[PDB]
Amino acid sequence: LSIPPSIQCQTEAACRLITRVTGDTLRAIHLYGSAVAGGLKPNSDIDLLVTICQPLTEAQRATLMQELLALSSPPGASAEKRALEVTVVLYSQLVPWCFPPSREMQFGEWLREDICQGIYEPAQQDWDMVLLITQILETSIPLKGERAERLFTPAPAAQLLKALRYPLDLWQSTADVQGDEYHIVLTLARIWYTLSTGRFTSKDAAADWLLPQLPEDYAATLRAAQREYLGLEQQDWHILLPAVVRFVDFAKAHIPTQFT
Q: Is residue 44 a known part of a binding site?
């Protein structure tokens, strides 16, 4: 399990930046995502988990967000510079597990304008953490420190069910769905996929797995989302809203209530 050469230099720069700002409290830095599974696409992001022992000073938070922003560019912006996603989490939140755990910090290109404004979102509870940790137990490269397998504990099956199904109650109505249709459709495919196959690294696999099992009506909707994810075509998701709403309902009806 190796790091693709093409991201080798960008990954090292973030690593040295993180180690620099974090200094002592740094426990581990894990690489995950398309870079280790599914293969890189022009639009893939480099994904890092940063495990730390104590919380960040506001100064450090500010330094990290600013400097990451600099080492990152929007996906499909430039060759030689890829979108970064960086999640900082307190060791004490994973070991022992707090449910849901808080994440200390998150960087991503969706924060670029907020960061330009000097707006830095604070620590908060994220059920996705449970998913994330479980995901990196399946596949990750330990860029700094111990391998995930040694460092992190599962995640009782019950909580995994809780964390996967949690987003389902986010979308009751059309208004819930209205501006998030692209994210929702892919998330629904991911949840269905993981619940069915038991496999938590879902981002590249889910759609391809599910599409053959979908009646054409819904497959058409999932297909557009995938194709947008792959970055080979972009869709106007506002016109696709009613087909997405239908997708949601059909998905809530058939998505497993338990692990197969």
A: yes
Q: Is 172 annotated as belonging to a binding site?
A: yes
CA 259 to CA 195: how far, in whole Å? 5
> Is 229 assigned to a binding site?
yes
Residue 252 annotated as binding? no
Experimental method: X-ray
Q: Are residues 115 and 166 in the same domain?
A: no
Are 222 and 243 within 8 A, CB to CB?
no
Instruction: Choose, from 67, 85, 104, 181, the residue flagged as catalytic.
Output: 85
Mark whether 121 is an active-site residue.
Answer: no
| Count of CB atoms situated within 10 Å of the CB of 98 | 14
Resolution value, angstrom units: 2.5
Tokens (6 digits) for 89: 């989490």
Clarify whether residues 23 and 127 are in a common domain.
Answer: yes
The total domain count for the chain is 2
Q: Are residues 15 and 138 in the same domain?
A: yes
